[PDB]
Amino acid sequence: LLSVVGFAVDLANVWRFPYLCYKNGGGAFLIPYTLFLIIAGMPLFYMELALGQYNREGAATVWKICPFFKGVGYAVILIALYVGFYYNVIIAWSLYYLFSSFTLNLPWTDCGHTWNSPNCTDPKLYSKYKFTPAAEFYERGVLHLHESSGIHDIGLPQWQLLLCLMVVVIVLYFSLWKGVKVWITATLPYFVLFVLLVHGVTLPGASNGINAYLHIDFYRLKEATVWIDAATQIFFSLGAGFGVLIAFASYNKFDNNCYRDALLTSSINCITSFVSGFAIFSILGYMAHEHKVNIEDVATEGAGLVFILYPEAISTLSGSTFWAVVFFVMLLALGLDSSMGGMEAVITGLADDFQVLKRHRKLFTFGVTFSTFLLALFCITKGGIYVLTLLDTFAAGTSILFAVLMEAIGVSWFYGVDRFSNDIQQMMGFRPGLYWRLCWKFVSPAFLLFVVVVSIINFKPLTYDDYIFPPWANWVGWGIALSSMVLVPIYVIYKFLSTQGSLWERLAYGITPENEHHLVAQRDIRQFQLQHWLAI
Numbered sequence: 001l002l003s004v005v006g007f008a009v010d011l012a013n014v015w016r017f018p019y020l021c022y023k024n025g026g027g028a029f030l031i032p033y034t035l036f037l038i039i040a041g042m043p044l045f046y047m048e049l050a051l052g053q054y055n056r057e058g059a060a061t062v063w064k065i066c067p068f069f070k071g072v073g074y075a076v077i078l079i080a081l082y083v084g085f086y087y088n089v090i091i092a093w094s095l096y097y098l099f100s101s102f103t104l105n106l107p108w109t110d111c112g113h114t115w116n117s118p119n120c121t122d123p124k125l126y127s128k129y130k131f132t133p134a135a136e137f138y139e140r141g142v143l144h145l146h147e148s149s150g151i152h153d154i155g156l157p158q159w160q161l162l163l164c165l166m167v168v169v170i171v172l173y174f175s176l177w178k179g180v181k182v183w184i185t186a187t188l189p190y191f192v193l194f195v196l197l198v199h200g201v202t203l204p205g206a207s208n209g210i211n212a213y214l215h216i217d218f219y220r221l222k223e224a225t226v227w228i229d230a231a232t233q234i235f236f237s238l239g240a241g242f243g244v245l246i247a248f249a250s251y252n253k254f255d256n257n258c259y260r261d262a263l264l265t266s267s268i269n270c271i272t273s274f275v276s277g278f279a280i281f282s283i284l285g286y287m288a289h290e291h292k293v294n295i296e297d298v299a300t301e302g303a304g305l306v307f308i309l310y311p312e313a314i315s316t317l318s319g320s321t322f323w324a325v326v327f328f329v330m331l332l333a334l335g336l337d338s339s340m341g342g343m344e345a346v347i348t349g350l351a352d353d354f355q356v357l358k359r360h361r362k363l364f365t366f367g368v369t370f371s372t373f374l375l376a377l378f379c380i381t382k383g384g385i386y387v388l389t390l391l392d393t394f395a396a397g398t399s400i401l402f403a404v405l406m407e408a409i410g411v412s413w414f415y416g417v418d419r420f421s422n423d424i425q426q427m428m429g430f431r432p433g434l435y436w437r438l439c440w441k442f443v444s445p446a447f448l449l450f451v452v453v454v455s456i457i458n459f460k461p462l463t464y465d466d467y468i469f470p471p472w473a474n475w476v477g478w479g480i481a482l483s484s485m486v487l488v489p490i491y492v493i494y495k496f497l498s499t500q501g502s503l504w505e506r507l508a509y510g511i512t513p514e515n516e517h518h519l520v521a522q523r524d525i526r527q528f529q530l531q532h533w534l535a536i
């Protein structure tokens with residue numbers, strides 16, 4: 001139970017799920033989330049865990065089972081880097097909020113400070129939500145967003161955010177430069193969410209919030225963005241698609257039970273997400289009651305909802321300083337562990353691939369943490385929330401859905417879901433079952449392909465709150481998405497143009513596992529027969 005709750009909650013469930021829910025309503029986002037967690041989330045979580053635990057390799061080198069698909073591991077490592085770029089910036093925000101939380105008069109309470117606009121209006125004394133003292137502290141006091149007109153005109157990095165990001169990358173380096181990889185980081189998210197839930201239900205005007213949460217709008221389900229949001233958040237919360245699961249299972253015992261691991265992680269994720277949305281909407285209803293505004297336009301739908309929503313919940317608690325310090329220490333440590341997991345996925349994959357990097361661990365981890373620092377300097381600029389939004393919507397998006405779709409395809413169709421079931425039976429001692437095989441070979445790939453094509457053809461232009469990104473920003477975002485999606489066909493063409501022989505024996509050498517290339521020469525290969533593909 002401790003092992004599954006330690007990683008069942010991460011920075012995703014606590015930071016990204018609130019604004020993805022609020023942006024898409026109440027249960028209107030919890031319906032696709034649960035359907036994808038049961039249909040595609042849990043099966044592919046269990047598939048990645050079993051793959052890593054059996055093959056004993058990272059994300060990139062696990063594809064010695066089907067060599068044409070190593071581009072998928074390269075893609076997930078690139079996605080992990082891209083996501084760490086702004087995870088470190090979220091941790092910088094957590095550090096700045098924790099540092100600001102060490103006073104009796106919390107800064108996000110009144111409008112009497114130096115960062116406040118002349119239009120800062122607090123209820124204690126039909127407006128907009130950017131004129132509340134909490135949103136004024138987030139935008140004008142932390143981000144300094146008021147000094148940039150858009151993603152074209154981003155300023156220089158923010159000094160305080162620069163120091164916070166330096167501290168983050170330094171602690172990450174000193175946490176990863178020897179460690180091949182705890183009670184508080186695993187128990188405190190749930191305790192904080194429990195306190196949040198109970199104090200939210202006791203708040204005035206939060207019943208309107210929980211009703212707006214429990215009201216499921218099906219016209220939102222008839223459109224396509226809620227499903228893309230739910231799929232991407234499923235793969236963020238569970239960690240499938242960043243190479244973290246395969247890298248972490250590479251170190252698990254051979255007899256370890258990935259079935260029970262996946263089951264507990266997925267069930268705890270579903271319950272945690274439901275109660276997380278419940279508490280988030282309790283606070284949002286309280287804010288709509290306090291600010292005399294509608295619930296649908298009471299806060300931002302960007303990445304900074306938590307840093308506006310949770311400070312306002314804290315300011316209502318008794319002993320606001322203690323609870324602010326506790327919540328932001330929790331957020332700091334949680335996102336810190338998440339970013340450590342991502343960077344360790346990157347390092348483990350690229351070190352299992354190239355041994356010159358496995359022998360040189362300190363230099364490689366310095367190069368990894370120092371590349372994620374220079375490219376996170378863009379997200380701590382004055383217009384860095386626009387770059388962070390671009391990355392958040394494009395780094396892991398259609399890209400991660402495509403990567404996980406190709407993982408499913410390469411494990412189920414080309415390697416064999418029957419071979420995978422035999423390997424799983426060899427690890428644990430029991431066959432997966434019919435539901436798991438039908439989801440691995442047919443249900444999850446079909447749902448993921450549908451979500452990918454719908455994510456491409458139902459693309460809405462990128463926006464911040466009321467800021468329409470220029471078209472070139474959308475082109476740059478699609479370049480960010482394609483930079484990892486093209487690794488799969490590029491590597492297929494590279495592996496085909498680097499193997500001697502005729503067409504069919506090149507194909508055979510590229511779809512046969514590396515350890516039994518002996519049988520390729522004697523022409524006894526499974527995938528060239530029909531009984532391999534008709535196995536359901």
Ligand SMILES: *[C@@H]1O[C@H](CO)[C@@H](O)[C@H](O)[C@H]1NC(C)=O
Nearest residue numbers: 117118119120126127128131
């Ligand atoms: C913001 O304050 C400025 C002060 O000159 C002025 O534009 C107005 O009072 C406020 N703007 C809006 C849109 O309320």
